[PDB]
């Protein structure tokens, strides 16, 4: 029960009125999901690789983490943002 599903209820509600800033490993925001690791609302922050909650403050410039992979997809929330960004 790592995920804490009150967090995931904040993921989807930030997806619908898309906010969902996608941040890379060099703490810059992109919209492509390929170079991006951190996922915000901006309440909660989750690295897309390990898929764990990191900080409730977003502004991911102040987060320490050590993970490295090439997976955690659902891209579906990422896809739902750009549709709802219009």
């Amino acid at each position: 029960l790592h995920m804490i599903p009150q967090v995931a209820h904040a993921m989807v509600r930030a997806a619908a009125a898309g906010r969902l800033t996608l941040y890379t490993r060099t703490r810059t925001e992109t919209t492509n999901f390929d170079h991006a690791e951190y996922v915000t609302c901006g309440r909660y922050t989750i690295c897309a690789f390990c898929l764990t909650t990191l900080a409730p403050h977003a502004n991911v410039k102040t987060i320490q983490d050590s993970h490295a992979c090439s997976r955690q997809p659902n891209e579906a929330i990422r896809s739902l943002v750009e549709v709802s960004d219009k």
Partner: protein
């Protein structure tokens, strides 16, 4: 002597090197000094007591004599060859390691055995308060027994062994006096194994209770030396450590705290509004800094803590200005170029970071509670760190709103969510904060009568004030507890202060007509309420404008009095109001005698 026993390994001549811990197949014999036998005897004594229940239930294995775990070796016994050389002991009584093991696991195994029975004996014993504290009071035995024959639930152990528990009991309750076999009558005196101890716990009518009054003193003495109540108003740098600040996370309500009432919180007092923008998660929001002054947590003077601004139950008027709804509330830092309180318009605000936004706009976080939609209890929360703000002269934490589109409706709103109950928790005790600066040492005396009414209640969790308050608070419970600062007894506390008022009012009279000879009946009484007002609300001694209490003498004075006062209480300190206290105990025994009278009738 003490420690393990040693013996001349080189034989005969025992020098500071021809020794060696006499170890062997049993482990090392450690000496059993006089007092350490008191314990193991006192422990075994409390087990032997349960002898009648060990045989009854075929457990146990005979009485445990401490003389079965020891030996009678002889040699030099110390902590090290060097010092063991000065303790030649002959035929001392040592207990070998492997033995120090059994006397241990035996007292442990037996301790379980009895701990159990001893629990059954109790639910039955205390189940008829065999303890009064004034005069006597009987309860005809027949009834008593025929009564518990009932109450006691079918799974006790006092029903399976009545006079197998009774014999254990007689030695613990000098209430139950067994009827002597050859005169078939009681004994007047009751002889329970705890003969002395039980004699010295009775609430002696002369003075409350020696066992009580004695401890309430040694207890206070502990604190007095411990925390460091002594030196409470010392005038010189003291490491925060000296204040053992722990479990210390205070919560507020900013956006209310005046900036001058607490340095760690400045405000944007500017004419118009200061709508700024910032791309947060793609979407562009506008921080407002609305109509009012919008008090914001300053970042400097903010001991790297864990700021957790809770926004709940607080109003959320998205009903009127629709502008408010849609905006995700979020705690955001704000770096300004020109110092705040001088920051006029948007071009002044360097940048704005959303350190922690709330997913989902202001229309899901709501909840209607009679028209006025409130905020569903949620906690936004940064983790400010001393150095993440290095260089940056101006930066402020602000729990604002982040409106997705400013409008005319939100022209008098001012979205500061600071009205919420923010809870800062210093996450790095070593560093404190004072008057707006971060330090590593306080100067106690400085913080006395230096805060204002609310320059105290507005203190920042683990800051000098909150530390020079946590401290007085201990010293406040030592007096409140041990010393009698709550009766007309002009105690040692209110007495230390009176001597200061005199010496003080006496020199202020020196030079000039001296038309007023010091009072004293009025001084004693003035200092009595001064020492009393302190015990009452320890805090006050920090607020500017408190009679007596805030002069440099007092406190520094008080404590050092209260100090020596505890180190002399005697034992019979309980003599204070030991009259009404006594008369109240007789009052209880008269009512409890009334109880035994029914146990005595109902169950004849």
């Amino acid at each position: 002597p003490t420690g393990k026993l040693w013996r001349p390994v080189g034989t005969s001549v025992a020098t500071i090197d021809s020794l060696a811990i006499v170890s062997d197949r049993f482990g090392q014999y450690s000496f059993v000094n006089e007092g350490m036998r008191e314990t193991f005897s006192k422990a075994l004594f409390d087990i032997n007591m349960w002898q009648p229940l060990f045989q009854a239930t075929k457990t146990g294995c005979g009485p445990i004599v401490l003389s079965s775990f020891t030996t009678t070796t002889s040699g030099y016994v110390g902590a090290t060859a060097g010092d063991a050389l000065d303790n030649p002991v002959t035929n001392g009584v040592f207990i070998s390691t492997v033995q120090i093991m059994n006397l241990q696991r035996t007292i442990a195994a037996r301790m379980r055995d009895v701990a159990l029975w001893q629990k059954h004996l109790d639910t039955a014993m205390t189940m008829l308060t065999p303890d009064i504290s004034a005069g006597s009071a009987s309860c005809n035995w027949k009834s008593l027994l025929a009564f518990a024959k009932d109450i006691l639930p079918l799974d006790n152990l006092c029903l399976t062994y009545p006079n197998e528990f009774y014999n254990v009991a007689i030695h613990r309750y000098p209430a139950l006096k067994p009827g002597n076999p050859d005169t078939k009558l009681p004994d007047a005196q009751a002889h329970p194994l705890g003969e002395v101890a039980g004699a010295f716990n009775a609430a002696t009518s002369e003075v409350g209770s020696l066992v009580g009054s004695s401890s309430t003193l040694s207890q206070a003495i502990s604190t007095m030396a411990g925390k460091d109540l002594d030196l409470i108003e010392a005038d010189t740098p003291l490491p925060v450590s000296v204040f053992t600040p722990s479990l210390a996370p205070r919560s507020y309500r900013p956006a209310f705290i005046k900036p001058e009432d607490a340095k760690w919180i400045a405000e944007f007092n500017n004419s118009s509004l200061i709508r700024k923008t910032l791309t947060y998660s793609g979407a562009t929001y506008t921080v407002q800094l609305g109509p009012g002054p919008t008090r914001v947590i300053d970042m400097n003077a903010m001991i790297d803590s864990v700021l957790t601004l809770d926004v709940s139950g607080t109003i959320l008027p998205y009903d009127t200005n629709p502008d408010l709804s849609t905006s995700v509330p979020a705690f955001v830092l704000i770096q300004t170029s020109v110092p705040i309180q001088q920051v006029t318009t948007a071009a002044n605000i360097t940048a704005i970071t959303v350190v922690s936004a709330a997913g989902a706009s202001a229309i899901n976080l709501a909840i209607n509670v009679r028209g006025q939609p409130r905020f569903n209890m949620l906690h936004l929360q940064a983790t400010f760190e001393r150095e993440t703000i290095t260089g940056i002269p101006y930066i402020y934490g602000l729990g604002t709103f982040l409106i997705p589109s400013p409008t005319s409706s939100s022209n008098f709103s001012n979205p500061t969510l600071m009205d919420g109950l923010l809870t800062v928790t210093p996450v790095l005790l070593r560093e404190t904060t004072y008057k707006g600066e971060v330090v590593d040492a306080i100067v106690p005396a400085t913080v006395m009568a230096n805060q204002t009414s609310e320059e105290v209640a507005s203190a920042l969790a683990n800051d000098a004030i909150v530390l020079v308050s946590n401290h007085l608070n201990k010293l406040a419970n030592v007096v409140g507890d041990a010393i009698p600062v709550a009766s007309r007894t002009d105690d040692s506390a209110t007495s230390a202060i009176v001597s200061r008022l005199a010496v003080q009012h006496k020199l202020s009279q020196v030079g000039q007509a001296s038309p007023t000879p010091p009072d004293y009946p009025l001084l004693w009484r003035r200092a009595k309420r001064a020492a009393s007002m302190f015990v009452s609300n320890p805090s006050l001694a920090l607020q500017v404008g408190i009679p007596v209490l805030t002069q440099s003498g007092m406190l520094s004075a008080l404590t050092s009095g209260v100090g020596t006062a505890l180190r002399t209480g005697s034992l019979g300190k309980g003599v204070t109001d030991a009259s009404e206290k006594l008369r109240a105990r007789q009052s209880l025994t008269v009512a409890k005698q009334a109880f035994f009278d029914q146990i005595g009738s109902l169950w004849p």
